[PDB]
Amino acid sequence: SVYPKALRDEYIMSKTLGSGAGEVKLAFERKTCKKVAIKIISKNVETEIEILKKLNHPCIIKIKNFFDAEDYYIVLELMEGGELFDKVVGNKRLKEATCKLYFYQMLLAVQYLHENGIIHRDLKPENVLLSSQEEDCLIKITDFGHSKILGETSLMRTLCGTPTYLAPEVLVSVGTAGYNRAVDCWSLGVILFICLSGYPPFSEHRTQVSLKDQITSGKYNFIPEVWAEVSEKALDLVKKLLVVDPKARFTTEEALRHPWLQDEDMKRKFQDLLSEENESTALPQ
Amino acid sequence: SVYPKALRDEYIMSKTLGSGAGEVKLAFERKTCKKVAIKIISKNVETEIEILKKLNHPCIIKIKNFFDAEDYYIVLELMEGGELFDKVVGNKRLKEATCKLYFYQMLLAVQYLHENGIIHRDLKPENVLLSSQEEDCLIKITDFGHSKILGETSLMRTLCGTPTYLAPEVLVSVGTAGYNRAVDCWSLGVILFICLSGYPPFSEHRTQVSLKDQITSGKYNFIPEVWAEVSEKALDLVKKLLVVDPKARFTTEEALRHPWLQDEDMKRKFQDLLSEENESTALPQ
Ligand SMILES: C/C(=N\NC(=N)N)c1ccc(NC(=O)c2cc3cccc([N+](=O)[O-])c3[nH]2)cc1
Ligand SMILES: C/C(=N\NC(=N)N)c1ccc(NC(=O)c2cc3cccc([N+](=O)[O-])c3[nH]2)cc1
Ligand SMILES: [Mg+2]
Ligand SMILES: [Mg+2]
Numbered sequence: 001s002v003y004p005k006a007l008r009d010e011y012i013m014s015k016t017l018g019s020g021a022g023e024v025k026l027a028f029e030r031k032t033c034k035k036v037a038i039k040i041i042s043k044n045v046e047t048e049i050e051i052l053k054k055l056n057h058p059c060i061i062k063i064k065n066f067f068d069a070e071d072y073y074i075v076l077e078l079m080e081g082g083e084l085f086d087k088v089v090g091n092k093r094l095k096e097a098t099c100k101l102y103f104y105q106m107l108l109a110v111q112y113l114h115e116n117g118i119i120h121r122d123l124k125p126e127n128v129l130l131s132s133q134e135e136d137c138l139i140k141i142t143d144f145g146h147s148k149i150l151g152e153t154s155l156m157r158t159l160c161g162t163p164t165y166l167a168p169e170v171l172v173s174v175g176t177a178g179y180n181r182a183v184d185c186w187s188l189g190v191i192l193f194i195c196l197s198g199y200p201p202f203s204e205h206r207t208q209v210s211l212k213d214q215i216t217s218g219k220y221n222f223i224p225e226v227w228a229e230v231s232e233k234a235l236d237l238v239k240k241l242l243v244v245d246p247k248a249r250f251t252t253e254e255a256l257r258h259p260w261l262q263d264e265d266m267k268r269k270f271q272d273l274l275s276e277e278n279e280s281t282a283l284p285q
Numbered sequence: 286s287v288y289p290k291a292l293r294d295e296y297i298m299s300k301t302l303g304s305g306a307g308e309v310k311l312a313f314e315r316k317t318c319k320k321v322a323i324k325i326i327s328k329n330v331e332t333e334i335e336i337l338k339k340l341n342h343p344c345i346i347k348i349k350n351f352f353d354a355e356d357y358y359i360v361l362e363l364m365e366g367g368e369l370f371d372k373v374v375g376n377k378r379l380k381e382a383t384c385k386l387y388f389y390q391m392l393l394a395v396q397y398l399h400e401n402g403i404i405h406r407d408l409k410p411e412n413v414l415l416s417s418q419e420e421d422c423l424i425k426i427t428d429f430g431h432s433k434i435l436g437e438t439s440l441m442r443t444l445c446g447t448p449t450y451l452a453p454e455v456l457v458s459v460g461t462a463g464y465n466r467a468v469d470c471w472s473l474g475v476i477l478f479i480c481l482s483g484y485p486p487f488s489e490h491r492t493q494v495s496l497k498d499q500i501t502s503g504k505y506n507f508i509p510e511v512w513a514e515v516s517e518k519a520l521d522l523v524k525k526l527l528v529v530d531p532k533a534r535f536t537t538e539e540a541l542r543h544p545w546l547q548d549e550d551m552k553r554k555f556q557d558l559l560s561e562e563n564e565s566t567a568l569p570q
């Protein structure tokens with residue numbers, strides 16, 4: 001095949017940066033001669049695009065352009081650090097400090113999603129991009145292919161009338177409705193676990209308990225020797241996110257107020273990284 | 286206000302037949318001089334229309350025309366018998382035979398919906414229309430405003446991968462997923478109860494138990510004197526439909542195989558009514 005003409009008109013395509021199940025290419029925008037990343041999706045991408053066009057957060061990827069052709073082409077800012085996945089694969093592990101910097105940003109991103117009525121639903125190291133190859137860098141969450149937009153539910157509409165003809169299971173669902181965002185907090189819990197320890201909390205490696213039973217019981221694989229070097233505060237947060245009951249699970253707000261994230265140096269590094277990214281116009285006064 | 290010009294072009298509007306929360310008018314189609322009903326909905330109606338345009342069953346209302354103007358206008362076949370509601374209101378009750386004829390048709394309709402991946406979600410006497418003012422008549426289910434189209438779920442897509450990062454509540458939901466159609470079977474249960482007895486199974490009339498607790502416990506209001514005259518087979522079916530566990534609840538197939546509906550005279554009256562409705566072209570042989 002060839003790249004679509006409208007893409008070629010605006011961009012020169014270059015080397016592969018990565019591969020999804022999917023592919024990411026380096027490209028140069030002709031107008032500016034600056035590097036961009038182009039995600040190719042083989043044929044609800046257009047509504048993922050609409051979601052991402054309306055979100056404005058430094059820790060969420062921004063769409064620069066979009067082409068709907070033989071395949072989809074999504075142009076975004078280059079994230080030269082690549083995926084978080086590559087930093088944690090093969091039992092590699094990040095310093096606890098670097099974990100905290102990254103995780104803080106993930107929480108800010110996800111908090112902003114949930115405030116804006118969006119649930120991501122596929123948070124994982126593959127979908128966290130690093131702005132640079134330096135350890136202290138900005139991260140951005142990507143891939144909104146599984147995301148969902150919260151709004152008025154069928155349930156809410158049902159509850160407006162009298163339940164003369166309404167099934168008991170609908171009434172029972174009221175106790176737990178409206179906590180779908182908590183699935184993101186679980187995933188974040190799993191991400192943090194992996195970042196701090198270099199291994200997954202739930203996996204079929206050297207165990208006879210099924211992955212499903214591990215997850216539904218909440219019984220993560222704790223190896224103390226790996227964790228000895230990790231703070232108690234870090235592990236405490238992990239434990240409040242990997243809570244099986246979604247109504248009891250920490251929200252992003254609760255996580256951000258956790259002792260582990262009350263870290264003024266970390267928050268300085270983040271603010272410094274932000275201003276560094278920014279290329280501001282002159283301002284009055 | 287005035288009726289839209291495109292409606293006026295094709296139809297002469299006449300008297301009110303009824304009122305929703307909503308209104309139904311008598312109209313005459315100019316081309317044929319024949320009577321039609323026009324439902325007015327003050328401003329997902331257009332997709333309700335698309336659902337009803339693709340369904341083809343004698344016990345489901347057919348759309349003849351549609352106008353999307355200041356309000357929505359939906360043209361359909363006249364159902365001169367009106368709503369089932371009016372036959373059961375004020376503790377009026379139908380002969381058990383008439384209940385069976387009507388209910389059989391409701392089951393056929395709902396069975397056809399569920400076969401076609403549609404759940405109605407608002408089955409009630411108000412949404413059952415009678416073709417004539419005779420007791421032995423055809424019925425049609427109407428009002429697909431709350432309906433939902435079944436198809437590949439997010440759940441199914443989630444289960445295709447590995448649940449490394451997946452929340453326990455999603456895995457727990459697998460046990461009960463795919464039974465949303467059972468809400469229609471519950472409602473049918475409530476409709477049948479009302480038809481046979483002339484009173485609602487669950488209501489706040491002369492009780493201290495909340496409507497919600499009545500429904501979730503499945504503890505319907507049984508008044509034996511009202512029921513003495515009703516068969517045991519009729520009440521048995523009622524009980525298999527008003528089953529609180531949606532996985533145990535009778536499906537439309539199970540209901541149709543129930544002893545109460547193994548009634549050859551009833552099924553003859555229905556077939557006779559069908560052929561009577563029909564105005565067939567000549568056929569080879
Ligand atoms: C929106 C989206 N996917 N949406 C979807 N699959 N439905 C999406 C998914 C992944 C990305 N990934 C990248 O931009 C991305 C991956 C990568 C790896 C090494 C190096 C770079 N880089 O930019 O230098 C990379 N960028 C970008 C967008
Ligand atoms: C599709 C629909 N509603 N959809 C919605 N509200 N979202 C809908 C709702 C109700 C009806 N009702 C009738 O056609 C209808 C009600 C009625 C009462 C006395 C007499 C007649 N009649 O036709 O002689 C009646 N027809 C027809 C359509
Ligand atoms: Mg994905
Ligand atoms: Mg309705």
